[PDB]
Amino acid sequence: HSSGLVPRGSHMSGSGGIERVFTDKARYNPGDAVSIRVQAKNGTGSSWSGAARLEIFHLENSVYTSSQSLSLTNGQSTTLTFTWTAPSTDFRGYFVRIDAGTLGQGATAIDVSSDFTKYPRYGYISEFESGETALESKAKVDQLAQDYHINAWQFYDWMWRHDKMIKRTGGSIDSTWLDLFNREISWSTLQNQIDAVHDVNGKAMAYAMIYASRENYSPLGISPTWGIYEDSSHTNQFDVDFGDGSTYLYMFDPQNPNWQNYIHAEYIDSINTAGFDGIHVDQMGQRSNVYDYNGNSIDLSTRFSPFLDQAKSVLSANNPARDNLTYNIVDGTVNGWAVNDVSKNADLDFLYSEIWYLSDSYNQLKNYIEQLRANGGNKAVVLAAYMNYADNAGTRYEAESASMTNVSTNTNHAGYTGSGFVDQFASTGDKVSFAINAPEAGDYSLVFRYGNNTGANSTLNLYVDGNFVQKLYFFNQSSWGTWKHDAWYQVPLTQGAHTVELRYESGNVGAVNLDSLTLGTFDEHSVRLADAMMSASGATHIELGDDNQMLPHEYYPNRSKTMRSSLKNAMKDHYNFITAYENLLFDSDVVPNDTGSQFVNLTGVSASGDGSANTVWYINKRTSDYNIVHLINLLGNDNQWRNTASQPSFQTNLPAKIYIGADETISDVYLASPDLSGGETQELAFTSGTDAGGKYVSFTVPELKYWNMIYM
Ligand SMILES: [Ca+2]
Ligand SMILES: [Ca+2]
Ligand code: NA
Ligand code: NA
């Protein structure tokens, strides 16, 4: 008479329970009513009844509890609401737990901050099509707000021209306009999205350049005498070629007051006419040997601050509620080009930096973040750091292992993957058809690795499951030995088997060598590690946008990679975590040097304090009220933040000893991890004592997967 190998009975587990827990807004003001929503589904196999219980925590302390009764027929769904009040102390993050017994558990987080610039959670919107309904604009904003607490959206490439941002014809705003790449921007869709951002208490930041006009700028009243030039005789203006012999950006002197007045009036028109909350100012990065119009040599690195101070000033005078400003410090690294002058001297509301290849290790990037924090007077730091940027990551299907019609295989150009590649793919009736599997329903990035040295674009017709989808362009390279994978199409797929086919048909031109097809996928391991390092170091990461897309590239509409459900779920936990614990992560400072011996020790694993490969990395920080120790699991992995990674070597029962100030006493030891129990703070059994090193505490860390934050 005992329980068996499995439970015996009429009830199921696994499916349903608490599906989602979220709030209507991304951010709240003190005193606000907060609607906490719980979407519940009874998949138990019979009726269910009981209490749904809410508990809210500020760090280690339970600050609110509440309960309501619930009953559901089998298969029934409902949405419950709990109403709370944002407590009076401004700038505080909270953890929210929902427990519904046998129906399961859920969690979310709440940010009470009257001004988003202290704890920005930056997302983006990069498409503005007339096909998008008001409900769909709203749905996509609501999803980012609910699932990640995004409180600011960078609206990318919304403008008509860099120097004329809203298109008017005869004083009337055009209902649609074509951007520099001939995308259709809808004025209705744009405003619907901006309103939807406002409805979740978010801010809409308008992308703009600091110093860019488009081609043919003179008729707009812009003078070439405000330009910056590659020589002292103003022969060649700095510019950007977009590769069609017509479309260009021309570059100007940010310090020139007349350029300032011109482009700032565009910034103000964008705020007032579109409803934006501020301007997200971009640049192209380091340019050496710069001259103004009159041939004087100028250091461009120090000319942004005056522009930005002036910009802030005209924004605040125009509308002090909607005057937010940031600027991209391009190519971020310690003492990098323009880093010190911008972060120290620009009147920015928070700092933003796009990281290229000057901060490749975790520790290098941590030092850059810390320099920005120190220079900027503890202003918030947001990084654009495009994950897996160079990796053709995802499930791979080799072209030569696929179904081939009127083509051949070969091995004569080195650098192919697998046994070779497809060639003689150059004439009508030629086909390659890949038999792929989608493990779950959703969007898939179809990424083709190819060669092409025919001297012009080659094209192939893409087909999915027998249906034509689009003509794809495969760009001309300098040699046939040059393999690229910048030809891609993102497509929705049902779970299961599909066919993906490239066909050379009437109207297709050129030829390609076809190496493979990859299902472009962000790698969960690297992404979770990088986000852990960034936020343990005191920064946040712009990576999510549009309809639950993740950012693969500097051109925000790029969809050459997609998140799979497992990564989406880890990002919900991560973004819950950086919201609920925002005070410990972004109010804290690094603990100085540890003269003599290091304050943190671990048993049974290699440990580093500088983000060394194949170690558990410890980071010790403090606020006035707390001592904090982050553990980031680099076991099994290198010290580089951007590239793909293996799953960390998960640890269990990791003994830890932390030294504390000898004039200090520890009542409790707390651990919180996005990886564990959805971020809920855990109270750990511990012992204290005194050693040669001083006063310490000692405890076993039950689990370390990616990132644990210990505090006391
Ligand atoms: Ca040029
Ligand atoms: Ca052929
Ligand atoms: Na949630
Ligand atoms: Na203001």
UniProtKB/Swiss-Prot annotation:
Q: Which GO terms describe its molecular function?
A: carbohydrate binding; glycosyltransferase activity
pH behavior is given as: Optimum pH is 5.5.
Record keywords, A-Z = Glycosyltransferase, Repeat, Signal, Transferase
Q: Which reaction does it catalyse?
A: cyclizes part of a (1->6)-alpha-D-glucan chain by formation of a (1->6)-alpha-D-glucosidic bond
Supply the EC number(s): 2.4.1.248
Q: Where is the CBM6 domain?
A: 395-520
Family, similarity comment: Belongs to the glycosyl hydrolase 66 family.
Question: Function, please?
Answer: Produces cycloisomaltooligosaccharide from dextran containing 7, 8 or 9 glucose units. The enzyme is specific for (1->6)-alpha-D-glucans (dextrans) and, without activity toward (1->4)-alpha-D-glucans, such as amylose. It also has no activity on oligosaccharides, such as amylopectin and pullulan, containing (1->6)-alpha-D-glucosidic linkages at branch points.
Q: What is known about its subunit structure?
A: Monomer.
Q: What is this protein called?
A: Cycloisomaltooligosaccharide glucanotransferase
Which organism is this entry from?
Answer: Niallia circulans (Bacillus circulans)
